Scaffold this active site. Structure first.
Site, PDB file in Angstrom:
ATOM      1  N   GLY A   5       0.797  -1.218   0.000  1.00 14.58           N
ATOM      2  CA  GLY A   5       0.000   0.000   0.000  1.00 14.58           C
ATOM      3  C   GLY A   5       0.833   1.272   0.000  1.00 14.58           C
TER       4      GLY A   5
ATOM      5  N   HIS B  17      13.467  15.784   0.759  1.00 14.00           N
ATOM      6  CA  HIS B  17      12.915  16.065   2.089  1.00 14.00           C
ATOM      7  C   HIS B  17      13.837  15.582   3.212  1.00 14.00           C
ATOM      8  CE1 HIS B  17       9.200  17.187   0.219  1.00 14.00           C
ATOM      9  NE2 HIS B  17       8.885  15.954  -0.166  1.00 14.00           N
TER      10      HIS B  17
ATOM     11  N   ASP C 150       9.353  19.312  -8.653  1.00 15.37           N
ATOM     12  CA  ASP C 150       8.475  18.385  -7.937  1.00 15.37           C
ATOM     13  C   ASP C 150       7.281  19.203  -7.399  1.00 15.37           C
ATOM     14  OD1 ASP C 150       9.210  15.494  -6.296  1.00 15.37           O
ATOM     15  OD2 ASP C 150       7.648  16.786  -5.323  1.00 15.37           O
TER      16      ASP C 150
ATOM     17  N   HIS D  14       6.093  19.038  -4.546  1.00 17.94           N
ATOM     18  CA  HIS D  14       6.323  19.326  -3.142  1.00 17.94           C
ATOM     19  C   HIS D  14       7.483  20.311  -3.009  1.00 17.94           C
ATOM     20  CE1 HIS D  14       4.263  15.382  -3.081  1.00 17.94           C
ATOM     21  NE2 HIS D  14       3.549  16.009  -2.124  1.00 17.94           N
TER      22      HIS D  14
ATOM     23  N   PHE E 256      20.893  24.636   3.002  1.00 10.60           N
ATOM     24  CA  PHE E 256      21.618  25.756   2.393  1.00 10.60           C
ATOM     25  C   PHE E 256      21.007  27.110   2.770  1.00 10.60           C
ATOM     26  CE2 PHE E 256      24.612  23.062   0.678  1.00 10.60           C
ATOM     27  CZ  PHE E 256      24.030  22.019  -0.004  1.00 10.60           C
TER      28      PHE E 256
ATOM     29  N   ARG F  17      -1.256  10.256  -8.788  1.00  8.27           N
ATOM     30  CA  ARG F  17      -2.112   9.735  -7.719  1.00  8.27           C
ATOM     31  C   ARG F  17      -2.071  10.599  -6.456  1.00  8.27           C
ATOM     32  NH1 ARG F  17      -4.103   4.676  -8.484  1.00  8.27           N
ATOM     33  NH2 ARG F  17      -3.100   3.308 -10.009  1.00  8.27           N
TER      34      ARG F  17
HETATM   35  N1  KJF Z   1       8.427  14.393  -3.518  1.00  7.62           N
HETATM   36  C1  KJF Z   1       8.144  13.519  -2.350  1.00  7.62           C
HETATM   37  C2  KJF Z   1       8.928  12.211  -2.431  1.00  7.62           C
HETATM   38  C3  KJF Z   1      10.436  12.347  -2.462  1.00  7.62           C
HETATM   39  C4  KJF Z   1      11.081  11.038  -2.841  1.00  7.62           C
HETATM   40  C5  KJF Z   1      11.167  10.004  -1.921  1.00  7.62           C
HETATM   41  C6  KJF Z   1      11.754   8.804  -2.256  1.00  7.62           C
HETATM   42  C7  KJF Z   1      12.263   8.619  -3.522  1.00  7.62           C
HETATM   43  C8  KJF Z   1      12.188   9.635  -4.450  1.00  7.62           C
HETATM   44  C9  KJF Z   1      11.598  10.840  -4.111  1.00  7.62           C
HETATM   45  C10 KJF Z   1       6.668  13.159  -2.344  1.00  7.62           C
HETATM   46  O1  KJF Z   1       6.110  13.023  -3.428  1.00  7.62           O
HETATM   47  N2  KJF Z   1       6.021  13.001  -1.175  1.00  7.62           N
HETATM   48  C11 KJF Z   1       4.620  12.558  -1.080  1.00  7.62           C
HETATM   49  C12 KJF Z   1       4.248  12.898   0.332  1.00  7.62           C
HETATM   50  C13 KJF Z   1       5.536  12.741   1.102  1.00  7.62           C
HETATM   51  C14 KJF Z   1       6.595  13.276   0.150  1.00  7.62           C
HETATM   52 CA    CA Z   2       9.105  21.734  -5.926  1.00  7.61          CA
HETATM   53 NA    NA Z   3      21.122  29.407   0.189  1.00 11.76          NA
HETATM   54 ZN    ZN Z   4       6.814  15.213  -4.527  1.00 14.29          ZN
END
Ligand code: KJF
Ligand code: CA
Ligand code: NA
Ligand code: ZN
Length: 369
Positions: free
Chosen positions: A22, A136, A171, A173, A182, A265
């Site tokens: 999931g 993150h 992205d 996010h 940084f 999704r």
């Molecule tokens: N951009 C982030 C995911 C970062 C990531 C994590 C692992 C491998 C590759 C990229 C995302 O989509 N998220 C959904 C909610 C929590 C973070």
């Molecule tokens: Ca971004």
């Molecule tokens: Na900076």
């Molecule tokens: Zn993301």
């Protein structure tokens, strides 16, 4: 101008790491991407490298010793003995313990750092690591499905030879971990475009601009649901052009998370693959050493399409819209085409909003030396 030399990092084992039943993050999407672009013939035009497994030494250039020791030790069979450490380091829920977790971190990170070394040695113009982009992860904490911040490590590698490095994040996010690392230096400018408001990670306000010597060197473009190719295109090129003019970086890192595509999704944007890839085209035009990384992305057929097309863009190689046969061909029905259509969702980002946010960010960029 000119066509560029591209080095691409991939380990065939990456697609076998499994976050658990999931869990929306599917490393398999990197293998699907790889298989699709091989089937388009793109291996004929670029060098393909298998990254090394980044060591604990490499990871502690940014991360704490205690956090990396924990990631190297924790396993599904010993989890019950580590309940305290798991909470301290934010592992066990969104960022689960899975078989081979540390090796996944090592391959993800190895690609990004290997790419940065290759750029530093002037042995390539562009390096690509679609298994990277884990924006993150924090110095001593997992976050947002990320454990080790490959981006921060790659930027630290670039800073050995580059006085100023530009980080751009498309992205959906906010690239909070890169920004945080940084935030107080002018040697890295971070620029993130992201959905903002009741959305992970909750950071990335317009008004977060950096601190200390880093004041004015963090740039955040907060967006609402439903942004489309036209709205995005209209602000990305002007913002990045102004950033290039004012900051004059000597290397660039571009996080290409595909969760900003229509139909994702977990996402709520309405970009096509062409609209997303326009960002890669814009950045490529500045003719700077460029590290292209992956990121989020949850509708995995579209992730494979997006990163395949962006690899083709990096290579200035036109590919047909008819998908070639491949090991995942059924995933691309019912159309079996490369490009996608936007949905009819409402774009909540009005043209006036987009221009206004752009104008506020231009005001901040006027404060650079
Ligand atoms: N951009 C982030 C995911 C970062 C990531 C994590 C692992 C491998 C590759 C990229 C995302 O989509 N998220 C959904 C909610 C929590 C973070
Ligand atoms: Ca971004
Ligand atoms: Na900076
Ligand atoms: Zn993301």
């Amino acid at each position: 101008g000119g066509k560029k030399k591209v080095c691409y990092y991939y380990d065939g084992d990456i697609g076998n790491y499994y976050y658990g039943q999931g869990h929306p993050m599917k490393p398999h999407r990197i293998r699907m991407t790889h298989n699709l672009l091989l089937n388009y013939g793109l291996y004929r035009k670029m060098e393909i490298y298998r990254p090394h497994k980044a060591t604990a030494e490499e990871m502690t250039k940014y991360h704490s010793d205690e956090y990396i020791k924990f990631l190297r030790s924790i396993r599904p069979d010993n989890m019950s003995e580590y309940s305290k450490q798991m909470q301290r380091f934010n592992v066990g829920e969104d960022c689960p313990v899975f078989d081979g977790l540390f090796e996944f971190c090592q391959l993800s990170t190895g690609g990004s750092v290997a790419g940065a070394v290759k750029l530093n040695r002037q042995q390539t113009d562009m390096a690509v690591n679609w298994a990277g982009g884990l924006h993150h992860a924090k110095k001593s904490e997992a976050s947002g499905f990320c454990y080790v911040n490959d981006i921060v490590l790659a930027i630290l590698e670039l800073l050995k030879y580059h006085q100023r490095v530009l980080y751009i994040d498309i992205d959906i996010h906010h690239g909070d971990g890169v920004e945080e690392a940084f935030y107080t230096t002018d040697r890295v400018m971070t620029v993130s475009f992201h959905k903002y408001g009741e959305y992970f990670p909750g950071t990335g306000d317009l008004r977060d601009i950096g601190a200390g010597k880093g004041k004015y060197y963090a740039v955040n473009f907060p967006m609402r649901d439903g942004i489309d190719d036209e709205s995005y295109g209209q602000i990305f090129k002007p913002i990045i052009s102004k950033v290039m003019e004012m900051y004059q970086p000597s290397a660039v890192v571009l996080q290409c998370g595909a969760d900003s595509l229509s139909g994702d999704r977990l996402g709520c944007f309405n970009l096509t693959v062409k609209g997303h890839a326009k960002c890669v085209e814009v950045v490529k035009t500045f003719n700077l050493p460029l590290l292209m990384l992956g990121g989020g992305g949850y509708t995995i057929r579209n992730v494979a399409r997006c990163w395949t097309y962006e690899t083709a863009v990096a290579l200035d190689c036109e590919i047909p819209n008819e998908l070639p046969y491949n090991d995942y061909f059924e995933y691309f029905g019912p159309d079996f085409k490369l490009h996608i259509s936007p949905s009819n969702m409402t774009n909540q980002n009005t043209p006036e909003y987009m221009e206004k946010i752009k104008q506020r960010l231009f005001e901040n960029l006027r404060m650079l030396p």
